Design a binder for this molecule. Structure first.
Ligand SMILES: Nc1ncnc2c1ncn2[C@@H]1O[C@H](COP(=O)(O)OP(=O)(O)OP(O)(O)=S)[C@@H](O)[C@H]1O
Ligand SMILES: Nc1ncnc2c1ncn2[C@@H]1O[C@H](COP(=O)(O)OP(=O)(O)OP(O)(O)=S)[C@@H](O)[C@H]1O
Ligand SMILES: Nc1ncnc2c1ncn2[C@@H]1O[C@H](COP(=O)(O)OP(=O)(O)OP(O)(O)=S)[C@@H](O)[C@H]1O
Ligand SMILES: Nc1ncnc2c1ncn2[C@@H]1O[C@H](COP(=O)(O)OP(=O)(O)O)[C@@H](O)[C@H]1O
Ligand SMILES: [Mg+2]
Ligand SMILES: [Mg+2]
Lengths: 280, 86, 276, 280, 281
């Protein structure tokens, strides 16, 4: 029931549609890349959009091709591209392959500041697919028969300089997604829709923290049981909190549905602000 | 911009090889190769050396119980044919 | 379908051929340098030219010539040059190294900026390759075995802010690219060749917007097409957009009219002025 | 049929011979440093001189004297000196080490540029080699066993931006190159020797463009051959020009000698000046 | 026939002798450091003195104090010390380790330049050796065994740019070198001793070029031999000059002593000056 921003949906629609469409005289970028701040919800929006459209999605982890002890990215991206192409025929629906954190989540500090051998391989593989999308080749069992072209989505914080050729060529399209007031109200409104908050209340939350990530507001819901747990500990007592809960056959702890008010959310908001401030 | 030079500490721990020098006890073969359009020269040569020897692109549990470099044919030289395309 | 300017193609062809021919007694420049205004189609027209002759390209991006490691941009040039020399030997065809946007890496604008060793080294390396194309060393053991001569194409915005010895007649052949009216007519006429416009109509479009780059006209076409595709998605609906695409009915062809191509172009200039 | 300037040939000849000869009570500099202006023919007249005498050259690039590894350019010079020393013992002829363009290697442009340690070491390595030409130690175990003395030739635009102890009478023989009118006449005459011009006509070419480097006149000849080459590309066809030139079973094409007259040369010369002014 | 300055010869002898001698109570510095301006004869006079006394030297270059592996130049200092300590035991003569030009290896020019961890460690490594010369441990197995004491001689241009605890009275004996008029006359006299010039003539040559290094005068002698060598190259011919010198199968050529006059020397001196000035501007 989560809200999707109209702009985000439009950018996905046009890219997927145009690639699948067969209009002569027209050139289309195969790869689309989205860069934004962390916890903006780029991954979350992509997954939602595909469900509404009903189009099949193949997901490849950023850490799956960044790790030295994983395999071969060059052999992997090719294999995933072929498999996605098979879905269109069998499934009879549009199929898209997307990558998350191409230059991130590896564990390395640089985050694309310094290139790696593995970084070079992805660039090489992607460039080959973008030039010749219709024909993609594995090491063995070369097939003469062409494959249906498949659109690619990529999300990150920023794009490396190695990709600059593709963008100048116009083979890659870069979309910068930043939330607005209207977008915030939608997303915040969707999260707390089940709780039941007035329109005026939702506006106040966004106004309290004008410059905040989308992830923060979602994280606020989690710290509602804290008061109950803290109070519960006292009745049981510190001496034997562990034993009863960890490995004892008794009735499981029961918590009444937390009351939802704006005051509680502001108090919780301040605490997370303070902690983030001190850490950075 | 700020560039630096460094010293470092180290933790520590496949068919086309042009660096290899042929032995006096080796069987050598010359092929006149014609690939399909959209196939590289070094890729086509590596495919011939693999398929005429052991093949084995994917490693299985049986393959790890033996040496892989010991029983393997390799391409060491590529020469173009004059006045001909691909 | 894309029109290459005959001036542009002849400058490239004669440069590469002369490097590969061994005419005795003549010394030839190893670098061809194309410079001008931004967005005039310096890179794009090379790619058309290299496809025509069917010759392999080794690219180095301009945003790669300045790294947090000292000597790392210099080491890459030598590494990529040796890779291209072997491709001439193996594939048995003409191969070219193209370094695009050199002005950003090896350039030296104001004195208010802080530069490093790399600026010094990138200029130094390109000088020595241009002097000894047959003798380029890989780090380690010295080998006196000659390699194949490879020509270099260099794109920039300005060469005034570059080390003086790297720009001399004997080391670099200079080419200033400024598209004229006849060039513009050809190129614009190549973009809209598929749509079906008369010669006279193409002339008028250039006259309407004379202070514009080649990119502007190609960007104008995309804007005309995007409106049409957006409306099609709305009419069909998001729920069943996949059913009527995989297997395009009720899709009005784009406007593409001289009268409108002026109207739309004026709107783009108004948007540009808004930021300005 | 290239003219080598007597001064340039004498200065280089005596420097190499005097190292290989042993005269008691005479101490001789190891390094010869040639400096001047761009395109006067420092590098080029050296190459003609080394070929006339028939002596081996080991080349070090100036843009190789800085690496991401610390002390690796310091290791390089020490290795290449030993390598050249072995070629004297084996082949039994004179051998020379040449570092072309030292200015941009171990030099400091301004007092605002951030430098590393490699610059500091490269200066010091050459200092010690020039002091002790006989004892150069390969890293690891020590060995007190002499090697042959090898001379070093150094090219530069400017030596003013270089470590001061490295430039001194006892360590480096300095030589400043600037060709005169008689040199110019001789060299330019050497270029157009096969063409066939009168002495008066050669004089006139120098007079028309007096403030020009040697490279300028050589660049004239390149431009003259363009018409023939352009015609050849059309006749063969743009589709298959690569095949004919690089990899063909036919005899390489022959170009008839174009008309060489003073009037035509001046016309082409003014065209090159116009191209230079365009950038200026 | 070369003249070593008595100040320089005394300061070297006393330092090397005092190390090998064992006087109870008297603490002696291990490292000797010689510094000053360029071309004054720091390096060259050391090599002469070692030849006169007949003692074995071990050279370490300044440019060998940095390597791509961390702490590896630290190991080289230790290994070269242990080696030289072995030569005393085997041969039975005095031996000396010399690190020529220390400034350019472990010296910090400014705060602009980025250095490495190795510059830190190298200064530290020498500090331990100067404290405990008997106990030098190569990385691996620890062995409680004494080794012989080896004195260290150090050249440099500026000691200011160097880790301060390495430069103290207790840890290093400092000797600044700057030749006077008498020293100049003595040295320049020794260079032209075979040539045959009067005392007054030698005085004049020092007076003509007063603000000059010792290397300047030695450079004069090379310039005079040019004419004879040039003529030899022509007679042989350029085509076969390489196979007439390198592969000496017959007999190397001989040259007669050129005319040496004060007038000719001054002319030569001005010509060297002219080349120096050309670079400056
Ligand atoms: N000849 C052409 N035919 C069709 N479109 C062209 C043509 N030339 C340029 N374009 C379009 O306009 C853009 C031209 O810019 P580039 O190819 O990046 O060259 P450039 O911008 O002049 O080089 P720089 O930025 O000065 S280093 C291309 O991306 C094309 O979309
Ligand atoms: N003696 C000569 N005879 C014929 N051509 C010459 C002669 N000397 C120089 N040239 C030409 O002029 C060019 C001179 O180039 P260089 O040897 O690099 O001069 P340079 O002074 O070393 O240049 P810098 O300082 O390294 S930029 C050569 O490419 C030759 O074509
Ligand atoms: N005492 C001397 N007797 C005769 N010739 C000398 C004497 N001292 C120096 N020379 C000459 O002048 C040159 C001076 O060189 P160095 O001894 O290296 O000067 P320097 O001050 O040690 O240089 P540094 O410290 O390494 S920058 C020697 O190579 C000799 O040719
Ligand atoms: N439209 C949305 N509705 C609800 N939650 C959202 C929405 N967009 C993002 N989120 C939240 O964002 C988090 C995941 O962020 P992610 O999609 O990985 O962002 P990014 O890729 O920009 O780092 C989850 O906690 C998810 O609930
Ligand atoms: Mg040169
Ligand atoms: Mg010295």
């Amino acid at each position: 029931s989560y809200y999707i921003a109209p702009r985000f949906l439009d950018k996905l629609a046009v890219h997927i549609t145009k690639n699948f469409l067969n209009i002569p005289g027209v050139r289309v970028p195969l790869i689309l890349g989205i860069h934004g701040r962390k916890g903006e919800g780029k991954t979350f929006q992509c997954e939602l959009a595909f469900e509404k459209m009903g189009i099949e999605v193949t997901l490849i982890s950023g850490g799956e091709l960044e790790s030295p002890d994983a395999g071969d990215p060059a052999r992997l991206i090719r294999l995933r591209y072929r498999e996605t192409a098979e879905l269109i025929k069998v499934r009879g629906k549009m199929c898209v392959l997307m990558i998350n954190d191409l230059d991130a989540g590896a564990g390395r500090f640089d985050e694309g500041t310094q290139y790696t051998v593995n970084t070079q391989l992805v660039n090489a593989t992607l460039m080959n697919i973008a030039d010749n999308p219709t024909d993609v080749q594995l090491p063995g069992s070369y097939d003469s028969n062409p494959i249906r072209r498949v659109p690619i989505i990529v999300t990150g914080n920023d794009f490396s300089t190695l990709y600059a050729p593709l963008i100048r060529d116009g083979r890659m399209e870069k979309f910068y997604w930043e939330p607005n007031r209207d977008d915030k109200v939608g997303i915040v409104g969707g999260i707390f829709a089940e709780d039941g908050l007035s329109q005026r209340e939702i506006e106040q939350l966004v106004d309290t923290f004008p410059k905040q990530s989308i992830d923060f507001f979602s994280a606020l819901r989690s710290r509602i049981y804290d008061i109950q747990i803290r109070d519960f500990i006292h009745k049981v007592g510190f001496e034997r909190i562990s034993l009863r809960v960890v490995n004892s056959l008794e009735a499981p702890p029961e918590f009444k549905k937390p009351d939802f008010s704006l005051a509680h959310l502001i108090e919780s908001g301040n605490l997370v602000l303070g902690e983030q401030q001190r850490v950075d | 911009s700020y560039a630096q030079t460094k010293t470092q500490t180290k933790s520590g721990y496949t068919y086309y090889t042009p660096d290899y020098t042929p032995k006096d006890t080796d069987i050598l073969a010359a092929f006149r190769v014609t690939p399909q359009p959209g196939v590289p020269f070094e890729e086509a040569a590596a495919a011939v050396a693999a398929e005429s020897s052991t093949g084995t692109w994917t490693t299985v549990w049986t393959d790890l119980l033996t040496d892989l470099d010991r029983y393997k044919g390799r391409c060491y030289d590529i020469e173009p044919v004059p006045g001909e395309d691909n």
